[PDB]
């Protein structure tokens, strides 16, 4: 009961410009995205907007993946989250 | 263990921005990091409100926080693991 997550960083207009392409085009292809966000303040380990992006399982996930084409100015990193969290 | 334990909190936004600058201002050695308020997004959202999410170093420093910082009574919180790579 962990959720499949990916997190995408980096400037907040093509982050939300790839948050837009990706409800365009690839909505099935997820299930949840959040608006931007970062860590706050002094303490951050980077000043650059995150989107949270979750899937219904690894498969989704992994396909996901394989489909989209991730802008080279966009990083990308997968983790988990609690399920219940959601 | 590669799980960073956290403690996600939820209700209008406002609240949560100044519970935030409390927890910065007061608490800032209670925690790890701190997210500014986001929410879910597109049509497809679960909840209809406004999150702060909050990292610790471990459960006990977790612990610690919650038995030290008072939760204003418009603020709702649920306790949960993410990745440590993803902070």
Known sequence: ???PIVQ???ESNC???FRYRLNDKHR???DLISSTWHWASPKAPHKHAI???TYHSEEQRQ???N???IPPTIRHKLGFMS???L
């Open 51 to 53: 989107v949270t992006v």
């Open 63 to 65: 396909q996901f993946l």
């Open 1 to 3: 009961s962990a959720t």
């Open 15 to 17: 982050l939300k410009c």
């Open 8 to 10: 995408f960083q980096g």
């Open 67 to 69: 489909v989209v084409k």
């Open 83 to 85: 399920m219940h969290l």
């Open 28 to 30: 099935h292809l997820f």
